[model samples]
Target: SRRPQGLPNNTASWFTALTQHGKEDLKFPRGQGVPINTNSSPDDQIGYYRRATRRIRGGDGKMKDLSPRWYFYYLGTGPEAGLPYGANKDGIIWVATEGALNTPKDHIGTRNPANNAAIVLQLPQGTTLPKGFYAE
Candidate 1:
């Protein structure tokens, strides 16, 4: 729960975890889908991002280097992720990570104490992010 669900830290192993395509291409699992264990259970469903070099693409869609960073997502339940009692609604709680393991030293994500606190300042505690990163 402390760390991300999948991937490592950042895009450190950016080149190793991916399957090279043409000249500027690379993939992590080297396949159609990711290499994650479908454990089913909502809590068990966790994933992470492996920030690789800016040269790989599984399907090769919209590749943007603007916000490059390795992050994760999962159900953020009550007390499970060190949050308040009703922080996570019922059985849902989309959790995101800062960045992938072994990623770039500068790759930053949305999950930040100071940054989160700043954003949460605009709204009241326990209040939804208003079509933001929280449920309504």
Candidate 2:
């Protein structure tokens, strides 16, 4: 899926959760680093933006190398307990991870791109992930 351009657009609670105290760890997963939305707000859609750019290329000029994947995590807070809501919960989106590919260094880039760069895993929504684990 294409990533959102700006920040998250939602209710006031979202803004508070994104900007207020104890939210320093909150951020969106991009590549090798976390991009903070300084203008995040309820109506500001800058927090929910997420997209994957090609980090490595193959001999055919295509994305073939699969060893090291780079990614960022989109951070958000859940609605207050007992507050009426749907899909409201503190969560994170795992971008990529390192894993061996079928081909042996014949794909693209270097023999092992993962060794040079970080790997990001593109995780699906509604998927349970490990705690205290932030992308990048």
Candidate 3:
């Protein structure tokens, strides 16, 4: 018999035809950048920083500007996950922009490859960070 069960006759010819025509046909898409509305806050520019004063509650149940070093806990996988990664838990942690050495000129999140690496804090509830953000 030239043809077998569920098989075509002339195996060499059939195999050649299958290999020649078996390829995926797809049409991908591209796009350009779009403008967004970021005028909601008072400061509309990116990477803007200002010196601000703040206070935190102490273990003794009092709001003081100079009392205790704060430490923040991380809730994630492995042994190093749920540990305290930050300090100033009991005092004011003042955040400001530095223009000197190891300081970044722009705010590219963690992409700013400065001398001092960035410290990214994850959301309290979510374990996985969305988009292209990650923790070291």
Candidate 4:
């Protein structure tokens, strides 16, 4: 089956917005001389660092470490779009993290007890994603 045409201009604009948001949230170092991949998989691609910690005396003051979560969003096409024809013609792919926890959850659908992260991908009209673009 063929996926319906998407709103190309709107999808592009949405991508731009998401890119900007990622830039602000990620806070890449200046002069690092490298571009970052915001995609999921190969987990080690993105790195993390632990900064300082806080300790309290009265209460059980556990040292709070700063571990930022990474999320990747992309528009799904074809059958993965999860939409019916005509009624939902927009072919946008939205991918998100199940979060780093004992029980992982889907990026968008359900409300699970996981600190999930998400990213949305909008496929341009008449386009499809490459194989392995997303994780199973």
Q: For model 2, what is the C-alpha lDDT against the true structure?
A: 0.27
Q: Candidate 2: misplaced stretches above 4 Å?
A: 1-46, 59-62, 65-136
Report every candidate's CA lDDT.
0.27, 0.27, 0.22, 0.25
Ranking by TM-score: 1, 2, 4, 3
TM-score of each: 0.18, 0.18, 0.14, 0.16
Q: Tens digits of per-residue lDDT for model 2 on 1-104?
A: 58864423311121111121232333333332223233322121212212222356666876674332222222232212222222244443322212212122
User: What shift in Å separates residue 129 of candidate 1 from its native position after superposition?
Assistant: 33
43-103 in candidate 3: lDDT tens per residue? 2111211112348666477687532111221112112222232322322121211221223
Per-model RMSD to reference: 18.7, 19.4, 29.4, 18.9
> Ten residues in a row with the worst lDDT in model 2?
11-20
The reply for model 3, stretches above 4 Å from the true place, is 1-45, 50-61, 67-107, 111-136
Model 4 lDDT tens row, 62-90: 55433332223222222222332123222
Point out the worst 10-residue segment of candidate 1 by lDDT. 25-34
Q: Write the candidate numbers in order of decreasing lDDT.
A: 2, 1, 4, 3
